[PDB]
Amino acid sequence: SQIPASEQETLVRPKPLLLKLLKSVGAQKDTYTMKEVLFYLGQYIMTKRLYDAAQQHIVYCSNDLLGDLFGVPSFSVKEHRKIYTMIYRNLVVVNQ
């Protein structure tokens, strides 16, 4: 397999729970770039209004698909490496 041009361009196949979350916001495919996964996760958070309205770096997700994926009731968007760790557990890397 070729090394991706950037981390954002890594090709991935979401595992079933994460794929269900993506499809809930309109995703149609089984394979995505990491950047695409991050955009659909942002769209899920905004359309379901999960961010704290006053402190918008905090996300509340207790028991929704997202909280079940990440295994937490809330998280801070500022915890970049923690969020990536949680996302990666829910992906398989694929060729190209």
Partner: peptide
């Protein structure tokens, strides 16, 4: 800062 802008700083 908007959630949109915080999340833009991940990718």
């Amino acid at each position: 800062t908007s959630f949109x802008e915080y999340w833009x700083l991940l990718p």
